[PDB]
Structure 1
Amino acid sequence: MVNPTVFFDIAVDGEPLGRVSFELFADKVPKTAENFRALSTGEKGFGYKGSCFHRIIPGFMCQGGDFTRHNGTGGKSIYGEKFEDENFILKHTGPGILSMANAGPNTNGSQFFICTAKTEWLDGKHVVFGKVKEGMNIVEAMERFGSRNGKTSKKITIADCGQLE
């Protein structure tokens, strides 16, 4: 009944930075929320632990989730390599929105982004499925290691992750 909560513990060149937690909107996008939850616990035998944020653009977003190729060309879902766009009920309203990255219609895998600005031009094209609950300050600290072209100045990793409650 209650929407699940997951955490990431973030590191910067291997040094601990802080924790970011997320509410997942399982009430509105159950299939998409479940994929992110299971990848965060690692319960299917694969997932986010140890992976990096490969593309960070200040004033736009932080992107990660490519645990197979580490550069934006890989990742896989708990349902197979790809799965469909579930719905577009929720919109990209401002900083803290959690949404699926993709390469065209019906190509969701594991890659995701955290908005650091309103990104309304993505509405109806990327599936919104959660939001930052605690640690937006940690996301803002991460964002400072990005650049205009998205290349990071230090390595930003998910040192640990899992489900709270």
Structure 2
Amino acid sequence: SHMMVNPTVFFDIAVDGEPLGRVSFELFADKVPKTAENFRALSTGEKGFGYKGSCFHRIIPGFMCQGGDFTRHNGTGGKSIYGEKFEDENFILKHTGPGILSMANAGPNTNGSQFFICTAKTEWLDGKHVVFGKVKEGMNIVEAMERFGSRNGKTSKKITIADCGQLE
């Protein structure tokens, strides 16, 4: 069969509570359905929990912006829609360049809710982080976010997902 149109999610980002702009993502539901569905549902909040009001805890210039720890706000928390953790679905897609959306994890088969947005090609992550989407619009907003990170990931201003959901 021919694929359905892949879903699209938005984040509205704020910096110290001041609006910055919107980033929207294509989710590769065609190729990585279970992992796309988790991120989609966490973005709408439809299971009773999710990304709205969470922070980007770890940002490294030249490398990636990381968020999705909506329970502990520091990289030690988060949960999936399936349970605390779920398996690596597949490694079909690779970390090819800026904009790629991929799962953060704590080793093999430990996906929760944490994710990162690449700002460069990061091929050393191929085969151990599941790639499941890409920025489709607002890569410039990710580049603005990026400036507020540092080599050790600590942010110099508070970067938050003020609002998020699905646009048709």
Query: Under a length normalisation based on structure 2, what TM-score does the superposition of the two structures give?
Result: 0.98
2:83 is paired with a residue whose SS is coil
Gaps of 5+ in 1: none
Question: What's the CA shift for 1:124?
Answer: 0.4
Q: Which residue of 2 aligns with 1:99?
A: 102
Shift of 1:103: 0.5
Q: How far apart are the structure 2 equivalents of 1:103 and 1:12? A: 27
> What is the Cα deviation at residue 10 of structure 1?
0.1
Q: CA RMSD in A?
A: 0.3
The separation in 1 between residues aligned to 2:80 and 2:73, in whole angstroms, is 15
> Structure 1 residue 155: deviation in Å?
0.1
How many percent identity over aligned positions?
Answer: 100
Tell me which residue corresponds to 1:134: 137
Structure 1 runs, 4 residues or longer, greater than 3 Å off: none
In the other structure, the counterpart of 2:83 is 80
Which whole-Å deviations, capped at 9, do the CAs of 1:86-131 have from their partners, x for residues lacking one?
Answer: 0000000000000000001100000000000110000000000000
* 1:143 equivalent in structure 2: 146
Aligned counterparts of 1:113 and 1:75: Cα–Cα separation in 2: 14
Counterpart in the other structure of 1:56:
59
SS in 2 for 1:8: strand
Deviation (angstroms), 1:77: 0.2
What's the secondary structure of 1:39's corresponding residue?
helix
Structure 1 residue matching 2:143: 3-state secondary structure: helix
- Structure 2: distance between partners of 1:149 and 1:67: 21
Q: CA deviation at 1:35?
A: 0.1
Distance between the aligned counterparts of 1:148 and 1:129, measured in 2? 26
Give 1:2 shift.
0.9
What is aligned with 1:154? 157
| Residue aligned with 1:6, SS | strand
Q: Tell me the TM-score normalized by structure 1.
A: 1.00
